């Protein structure tokens with residue numbers, strides 16, 4: 432996260448850190464708890480991942496330093512990538528991780544609500560992006576989970592900023608005209624969480640953008656409300 436601040440322990444209890452153990456263990460991507468056995472994340476995170484056996488999901492983490500060889504984790508039974516996914520920039524950048532065991536919910540770890548199809552008309556004014564990613568384009572994975580408040584921008588406005596791309600209705604954009612706050616490398620797969628009527632909703636999945644936090648280059652996120660039928664279908 433560029434231009435953010437450290438999170439409070441437990442304030443984003445749906446946020447997980449997905450690790451790979453190959454060749455040695457490291458953070459791979461963010462993700463969100465959406466059900467007892469289910470993490471929602473980005474499809475592009477699994478480039479070159481041949482097997483779910485190299486994955487570990489850690490929940491209830493603030494600092495990466497909490498994760499040691501003796502720290503408990505959730506195994507991944509199945510990676511489910513959207514069948515129309517080809518690459519992040521062309522959309523469908525969405526994946527489900529079916530966990531080997533179920534998450535026991537607590538103040539440190541609990542699911543985020545998916546948006547309702549009836550909330551497409553809602554104007555979210557309280558949206559946050561979170562993760563352990565770089566704080567500049569050229570950086571490293573951070574110890575402490577970072578957060579940044581970022582305004583949504585219209586698809587028409589976003590499309591103006593990405594003339595070489597097609598910004599579809601299955602994408603959603605967020606950023607400041609002047610830049611300065613954005614997701615960056617290592618934040619992908621994590622949530623864009625918007626608070627509305629005292630309830631947090633998983634509005635976006637961190638997907639792509641041109642560099643990080645640049646002027647007139649909003650972040651692009653998977654528009655989660657467009658995938659609620661897919662999620663239901665795949666989680667049955």
Ligand SMILES: NC(N)=NCCCCNC(=O)[C@H](Cc1ccccc1)NC(=O)c1ccc2[nH]c(=O)cc(O)c2c1
Pocket residue numbers: 457458459460475476477478564571572613614615616617618619637638639640641642643644649650651
């Ligand atoms: N809003 C904007 N401006 N962009 C959207 C966010 C940036 C997207 N890229 C990303 O977030 C990559 C995508 C990716 C995922 C998995 C594997 C490889 C690449 N992430 C990374 O490049 C990435 C992921 C995990 C990492 N772990 C480490 O220990 C060291 C790293 O340098 C590292 C880098």
